[PDB]
Design a protein around this nucleic acid. Structure first.
Ligand SMILES: Nc1ncnc2c1ncn2[C@@H]1O[C@H](COP(=O)(O)OP(=O)(O)NP(=O)(O)O)[C@@H](O)[C@H]1O
Ligand SMILES: Nc1ncnc2c1ncn2[C@@H]1O[C@H](COP(=O)(O)OP(=O)(O)NP(=O)(O)O)[C@@H](O)[C@H]1O
Ligand code: SF4
Ligand code: SF4
Ligand SMILES: [Mg+2]
Ligand SMILES: [Mg+2]
Ligand SMILES: [Mg+2]
Ligand SMILES: [Mg+2]
Ligand SMILES: [Mg+2]
Ligand SMILES: [Mg+2]
Ligand SMILES: [Mg+2]
Ligand SMILES: [Mg+2]
Ligand SMILES: [Mg+2]
Ligand SMILES: [Mg+2]
Ligand SMILES: [Mg+2]
Ligand SMILES: [Mg+2]
Ligand SMILES: [Mg+2]
Lengths: 178, 241, 97, 582
RNA sequence: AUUCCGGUUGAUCCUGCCGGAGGCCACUGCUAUGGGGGUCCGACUAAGCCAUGCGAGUCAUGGGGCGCCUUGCGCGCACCGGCGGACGGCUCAGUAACACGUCGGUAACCUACCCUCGGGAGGGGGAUAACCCCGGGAAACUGGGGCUAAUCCCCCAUAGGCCUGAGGUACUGGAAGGUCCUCAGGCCGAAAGGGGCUCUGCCCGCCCGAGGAUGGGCCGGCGGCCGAUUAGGUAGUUGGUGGGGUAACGGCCCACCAAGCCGAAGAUCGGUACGGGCCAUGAGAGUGGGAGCCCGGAGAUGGACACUGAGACACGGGUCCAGGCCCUACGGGGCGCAGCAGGCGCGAAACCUCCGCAAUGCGGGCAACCGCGACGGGGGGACCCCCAGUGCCGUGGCAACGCCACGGCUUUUCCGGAGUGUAAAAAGCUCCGGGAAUAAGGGCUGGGCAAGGCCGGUGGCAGCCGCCGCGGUAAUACCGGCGGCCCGAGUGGUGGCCGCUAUUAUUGGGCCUAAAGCGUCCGUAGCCGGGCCCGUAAGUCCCUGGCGAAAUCCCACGGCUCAACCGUGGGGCUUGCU
């Protein structure tokens, strides 16, 4: 009767709702996602945050206070909330905020990639460093403290400013919503 | 089925060992010895995991057979030997001594100490037989046994503690179980907690007696008398935590 | 190659210095045990007859390998304590047939 | 192809309601796969040509009388080697077993020599296409996952110093000079020449030269060469050919005393020496000239009895419809020839050979019989004595068999005769069919099995209509059913032509089966060959066996002969009674 | 996401069932690039049968020998002797039971190895392997004679052990048929002062006693399926007296006394089933499952019985029956894979007859070390899970969501190589070189249900259709092309469980007409019960002590690039019991 590793993403209750399909199609094009699986993964992350917040609203002390503090400091660390935040703000959060904390998206920002799809390729081909560490997982959620340490790899041609694609990417220095 | 157990699976191991339960399949099954399985850990784990003088059991066994680790002043060459609560693990080549004591989490740890205290071992008396020759055998919680005479048989009582000079086994400083006695808990919920005794309740039949204990910060908590280990009259005098 | 030591702890029971170190190999492959050993004896004037390298492990996306080496006070302790496969790897021993 | 079989001991057609036929899909769909019969006691019979397996009958029969068996097929496997796009294929190889001695029993034409060459590195498998000219690499890559992978890895990395005694002793004879002593001292690397001599009884021939050697003397030499050579793997392809009973016993003893921590593989057709000499024996089954599959290990006595019964009870294969049987049953005179070839005096003590009766020739390995046949064919002329009537149409077949002709079998038999292949002939429908050469007509001869070749030479020799046939070592390289078939062929042709035949061999089964008289050679091997008048069968057998002090016991219900251990109760009884070979 | 949608009519509202839509498990079609992690892989049918090999050995510091080193030192070999082989490993047949879980008990018991303490090791004697001579027997196996030792065996005494009787009351305990002291009568009755060194001391050892520990045995309270178309069951059965037996209490067994015990709150019987921790599902309540990891139990073809040992009624030991198979010289002998691999067979339904003791551990050993199909390492496999790939950038064009061309880039993956990695290897990791090459399907396309007023073929045929329903010459519903939608290295089909289902309803359903109020009354158990006062404090609530293993679950923090995974800590879980 043992453990049996379970999925960390939830699929929708109905597969063919026009509203959900349209919404997800838009998100997937905006954020350049390969998989509904990937999207639903981040949705499930959010859902678990929300459920914890709910429980801790409807909870009592000495524990469920610890977990309140832990939830809030985790979300601060991830960059989803400010330090002065609350469970009300958890419930205000969105999957878009999560996807904005992906690495692919921050690299489309930080003017490093010119396109989320090219950001994906840079990550996967090994041209992005986070705190000196090569990361190749574009779904990696960046911490708000690691965000300012994102850079091309030292062993990357894109780190040579003479590189053609680097020159194009910096011909278009842009950021903001991603 | 047909007989005794010669093995132990690392998941089925004691909860008080600091063992890394999922890394391998097997654990050292302790030999019968001084203490119990609930209040002990094997010397291999002490030499290899706790102190880190070996990454491997072959190295540890070489060490133990060379004779570099004492347990209460005696060389112990077996890697399955039980090392228990309030035991002194000495390494002279390094000049280190450790007291095996429990943690607040309930697990066994090594508290560093020096030579003076390292020549001391407190022993809860835990029983008292009358043996042939009309002599008194004190039956102590490390499974040890001390013979005394019908003269001080009354100075010696069951829940008391005896400080013992261990490479020689000479009693010094009987510490009685009374009110005001400084105490160190060894098991339960209030594990690595200490204070002065306040009260004792008796509970008619085989229900164990209970002691009410006052900590340093004035708090006041109960536990079992058998789990209440006396370390001093008014001060622990054995450098506990 | 650049060696940068992290920890150097003695073990009088077995008789060996245990060295944990970083090998920075920016731009190059992870170095060979021979070259690491040479640089290590230089960085620390050790007896290469007794120095034995346990591991050099390179990680994902780092070009900073992590190594564990051992420096015995006596070759006899080395041959007694240390296993034959490690000795063969460092080349102290030609496998005995 | 799985079909059903009935036990007929558990079958009770009365107390059954005939659930088998009733719950058969084929009978229900109209066909016939199970049906009653008066060929048996009103009991059912199963027609394999229609049964599809499926076991309904098995689990409907209340008295669990029906079982499913397996019939072999040229369909399913991972073919290891194909010689030719339509010639022959092989499924599986046996693994050579670090320290044990492995036997490989099989039949004629099924893949023994082929297995051995694959394991010896002589040839590469070429799993599918005979073409594709790829060896060593892709073979290893394809055998990945197995233990034979390790074997071949070492073999192709030449980490083992394999030897190989080959099936064609004359093709080996051609490639060595000197005499035995310097041959052996030159080839030795283990220092056991004395032991080898004492075992294989090579004292007399210790100074004779290789070219003038008898068949079995030469065999002993090659076997000794192989033994003395140091290696990790030791392959012996039919090391019992041209030998006599005692010498092949000694040979087995030598092999299993001197090779005791080596991989050893042994192909041999002699069940006696395989019972001895083998720890395990793989069986090779299939259809001769078509396909061969290897079996499981099958310890010697079990493997033998299984090979004899058909069935192998680990693959659940019925490899033969029926069992081996072990059946039971003047025109020229001369003077007492004396002959002398440098040494080896020979005296024969004349006979009569009435009509077409068969004359066997028995004796040790090293006295006459081949000199004698050579004299009769006239290759050698006697120091004294001669045959009468001389100058008679003659044929011959020596023991110098090896592949020499470059044409095909149809040409061979053509230039031999017309009766060899004219289906007009009783000769054809008796010999060439029962020998199954119609399945080898379009096969070149230099690529044949030892037994197919032997059958061919015998066919030619008996197709050449004559008055004096002479066949030496005809049973060599042959299995047991073929031994008996060949014997029946000889007897048939000889009694049809009313001629003489002089069969030399070391197979008392053959001599007992056909020989209506025999001739025994006595004397010191290689020094003196003293034959005698033709003697009746049992007497000559008993004398030939009283010499060499060997004894045989035949099972009654089958007839399988087996040698009795020296000193055994039955040896002593059969000796003190004089009933050698009962 | 605490959800709905389609279907009874000419239309409507209901009831109600079917279906869709979700997840998981197993088989399965088509398809398939990579890596990592993990408690996955002959469990479902056959606890059916098994070819081969391996899975338990170790000690030369117990003993005498045989051999090799020219001998010394030393090396090897078996044999006797010890220790172990009763663990581990596999399977789930049987079992509805103190088997399991949990709380407790044993003052009613055993325990080799281990620890502590306290003591002791005295005096004799003997045999027999190995070896030597001869063998027998097909084998399996086995005989006779000679010779020899021991940490082998026997004896004697001293200690000690057990019983009984008397009395003293020193010990512990909650409580003495216990321990202890003295005395009586008895029975049983040890030991290796052995071996090795740096030898006058040390090490490893032998026996007894007291305790402990370890591992078990036994007892009890509570707790957990179905059936009344199973209602009476039990005869040593319930109890007692006295015994025997057992390690130990016990109708466990016996002799003699009595008539009890269980049961409608369901006994007995039958059916099914290893139990649990856990798992799946679901908003939860709940429903369901209980192969894989741990704990316990049981079993080793079925059945029955014993020896030896601390421990077995003994998976790799013994005996018999039944049943089957193998070898045989027909006299006899041997085997039962539910160990790892591998096969047969069964089936819809599951891998290699690999490598290594390097880790973890076990046993042996003074130790070094040796062995271990445990374990580890690999490989095979659309087992689960995590991370990714099948290109990206510009310009220009298009039937512009995307494609095509022209130029540029990168190289995760592919190819090759070097180092590290590894027990060795492989993978992985770092680096070099080459090059957009080397890499996308499956289903659907009338509505449920996202997506075609397109085309060609067939023409109530063929076919589809989960349900509704389409199809009889203009078919968006079959087949095909083009297109499009969903998911995507996966996607579909079949079966099963949960959900849907407030179609089992405690939460939370209904019973005039839809399924459903006994024909009516009376009453036993059961359940529900007016108001005040007093008490108790059983339920109930609070607080506190001891327990309810670990893993699993939640959370944070750390380490493998992140993750999965692992560790640290906090919490929860176990129905709870006390
Ligand atoms: N080089 C070859 N080329 C083509 N066919 C061959 C070759 N060698 C053998 N064959 C055929 O393959 C079949 C079996 O091969 P082979 O291994 O030689 O038989 P075998 O087992 O040795 N029988 P035998 O020697 O008679 O005991 C024979 O019938 C040959 O005709
Ligand atoms: N040319 C020759 N010169 C001298 N001696 C010869 C010659 N040929 C044969 N011999 C010897 O004659 C003796 C018998 O010869 P041969 O008849 O060929 O052997 P065999 O008895 O048939 N044994 P086998 O063929 O193995 O069954 C052997 O010792 C030969 O060495
Ligand atoms: S096999 Fe069975 S069904 Fe057929 S005849 Fe025999 S008993 Fe009847
Ligand atoms: S197996 Fe089936 S088809 Fe063949 S004979 Fe038996 S019942 Fe007929
Ligand atoms: Mg051949
Ligand atoms: Mg000859
Ligand atoms: Mg509707
Ligand atoms: Mg099975
Ligand atoms: Mg299983
Ligand atoms: Mg005595
Ligand atoms: Mg069952
Ligand atoms: Mg079986
Ligand atoms: Mg499967
Ligand atoms: Mg449709
Ligand atoms: Mg219903
Ligand atoms: Mg209703
Ligand atoms: Mg737990």
């Amino acid at each position: 009767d043992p453990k049996r590793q379970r999925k960390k993403y939830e699929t929708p209750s109905h597969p063919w709702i026009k509203e959900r399909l349209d919404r997800e199609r838009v998100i997937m094009r905006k954020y350049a996602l390969k998989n509904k699986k990937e999207l639903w993964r981040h949705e499930t992350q959010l859902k678990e945050f929300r459920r914890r917040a709910r429980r801790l609203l409807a909870a009592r002390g000495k524990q469920a206070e610890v977990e309140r503090v832990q939830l809030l400091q985790r979300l601060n660390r991830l960059g989803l909330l400010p330090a002065d935040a609350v469970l009300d703000d958890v419930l205000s959060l969105t999957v878009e905020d999560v996807l904005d904390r992906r690495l692919q998206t921050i690299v489309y920002k930080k003017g490093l990639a010119r396109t989320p799809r090219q950001a994906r390729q840079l990550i996967v081909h090994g041209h992005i460093e986070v705190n000196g560490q090569i990361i190749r997982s574009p779904g990696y959620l960046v911490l708000k403290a690691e965000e300012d340490t994102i850079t091309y790899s030292k062993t990357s041609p894109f780190a040579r400013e003479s590189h053609p694609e680097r020159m194009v990417i910096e011909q278009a220095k842009q950021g903001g919503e991603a | 089925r047909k007989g005794a157990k010669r093995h132990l699976k690392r998941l089925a191991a004691p909860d008080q060992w600091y063992i890394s339960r999922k890394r391998y399949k097997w654990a050292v099954r302790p030999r019968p010895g001084p203490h119990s399985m609930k209040t002990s850990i094997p010397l291999l784990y002490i030499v290899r995991d706790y102190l880190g003088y070996a990454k491997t059991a072959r190295e540890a066994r070489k060490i133990l057979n060379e004779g570099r680790i004492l347990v209460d002043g005696r060389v112990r060459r077996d890697y399955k030997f039980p090392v228990g609560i309030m035991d002194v693990v000495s390494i002279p080549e390094t000049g280190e001594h450790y007291r095996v004591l429990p943690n607040r989490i309930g697990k066994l740890v090594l508290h560093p100490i020096s030579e003076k205290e390292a020549n001391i071992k407190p022993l809860r008396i835990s029983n008292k037989r009358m043996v042939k020759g009309a002599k008194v055998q004190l039956n102590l919680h490390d499974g040890s046994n001390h013979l005394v005479t019908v003269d001080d048989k009354d100075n010696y009582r069951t829940a008391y503690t005896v400080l013992m000079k261990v490479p020689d086994r000479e009693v010094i400083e009987i510490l009685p179980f009374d009110v005001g006695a400084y105490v160190f808990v060894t098991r339960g919920k209030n594990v690595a907690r200490k204070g002065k005794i306040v009260e004792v309740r008796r509970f008619p039949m085989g229900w164990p007696d209970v002691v009410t204990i006052e900590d340093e910060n004035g708090e006041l908590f109960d536990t079992l008398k058998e789990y209440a280990f006396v370390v001093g009259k008014e001060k622990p005098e054995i450098s506990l935590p | 190659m650049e060696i940068k030591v992290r920890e150097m702890k003695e073990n009088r029971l077995l008789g060996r210095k245990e060295i944990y170190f970083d090998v920075i190999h920016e731009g190059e492959a992870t170095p060979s045990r021979a070259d690491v050993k040479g640089k290590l004896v230089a960085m620390l004037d050790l007896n290469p007859e007794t120095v034995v390298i346990q591991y050099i492990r390179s990680y994902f996306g780092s070009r900073v390998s992590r190594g564990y080496a051992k420096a015995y006070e006596s070759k006899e302790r080395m041959l007694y304590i240390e296993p034959e496969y490690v000795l063969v790897r460092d080349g102290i021993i030609k496998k005995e047939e | 192809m799985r079909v059903a079989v009935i036990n007929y001991d558990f079958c009770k057609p009365d107390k059954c309601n005939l659930e088998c036929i009733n719950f058969c899909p084929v009978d229900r769909s109209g066909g016939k796969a199970i049906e009653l019969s008066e060929i048996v006691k009103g009991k059912p019979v199963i027609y394999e040509e229609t049964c599809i397996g499926c076991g309904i009958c098995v689990k409907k029969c209340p008295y669990e009388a029906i079982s499913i068996v397996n019939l072999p097929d040229e369909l399913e496997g991972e073919v290891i080697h194909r010689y030719k796009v339509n010639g022959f294929k092989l499924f599986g190889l046996p693994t050579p077993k670090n320290n044990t001695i492995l036997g490989v029993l099989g039949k004629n034409g099924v893949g023994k020599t082929t297995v051995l060459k694959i394991l010896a590195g002589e040839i590469i498998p070429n799993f599918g296409d005979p073409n594709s000219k790829v060896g060593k690499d892709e073979v290893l890559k394809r055998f990945r996952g197995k233990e034979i992978y390790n074997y071949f890895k070492e073999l192709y990395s030449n980490e083992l110093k394999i030897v190989h005694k080959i099936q064609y002793v004359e093709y080996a004879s051609k490639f060595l000079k000197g005499t035995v002593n310097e041959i052996l001292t030159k080839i030795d690397e283990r220092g056991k020449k004395d032991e080898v001599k004492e075992l294989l009884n090579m004292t007399n021939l210790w100074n004779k030269d290789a070219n003038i050697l008898s068949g079995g003397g030469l065999q002993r030499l090659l076997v000794a060469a192989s033994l003395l050579r140091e290696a990790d793997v030791y392959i012996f392809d039919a090391p019992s050919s041209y030998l006599d009973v005692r010498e092949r016993m000694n040979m087995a003893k030598a092999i299993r005393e001197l090779l005791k921590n080596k991989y050893v593989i042994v192909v041999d057709h002699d069940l006696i020496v395989l019972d001895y000499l083998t720890d395990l024996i793989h069986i090779i089954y299939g259809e001769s000239s078509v396909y061969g599959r290897v079996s499981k290990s099958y310890a010697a006595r079990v493997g033998i009895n299984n090979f004899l019964k058909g069935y192998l009870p680990a693959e659940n294969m019925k490899i033969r419809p029926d069992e081996i049987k072990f059946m039971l049953k003047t025109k020229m005179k001369w003077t007492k020839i004396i002959k002398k070839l440098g040494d080896f005096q020979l005296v024969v003590d004349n006979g009569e050979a009435k009509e077409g009766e068969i004359i066997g020739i028995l004796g040790p390995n090293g006295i006459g019989k081949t000199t004698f046949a050579r004299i009769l064919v006239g290759e050698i002329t006697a120091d004294e004595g001669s045959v009468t009537p001389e100058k008679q149409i003659l044929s011959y077949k020596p023991q110098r068999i090896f592949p020499n002709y470059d044409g095909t079998v149809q040409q061979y038999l053509e230039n031999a005769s017309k009766d060899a292949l004219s289906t007009s002939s009783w000769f054809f429908e008796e010999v060439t069919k029962r020998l199954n050469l119609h399945r080898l007509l379009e096969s070149n001869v230099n690529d044949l099995s030892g037994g197919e070749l032997q059958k061919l030479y015998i066919a030619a020799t008996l197709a050449k209509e004559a008055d004096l046939y002479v066949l030496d070592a005809p049973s060599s390289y042959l299995d047991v059913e073929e031994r008996y078939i060949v014997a029946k062929a000889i007897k048939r042709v000889t009694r049809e032509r009313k001629a003489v035949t002089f069969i030399i061999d070391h197979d008392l089964s053959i001599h007992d089966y056909i020989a209506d008289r025999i001739i025994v050679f006595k004397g010191e091997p290689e020094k003196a060959g003293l034959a005698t008048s033709p003697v009746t069968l049992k007497t000559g057998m008993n004398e030939f066996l009283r010499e060499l002090e060997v004894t045989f016991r035949r099972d009654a219900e089958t007839g399988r002969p087996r040698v009795n251990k020296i000193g055994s109760y039955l040896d002593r009884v059969q000796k003190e009674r004089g009933d050698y070979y009962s």
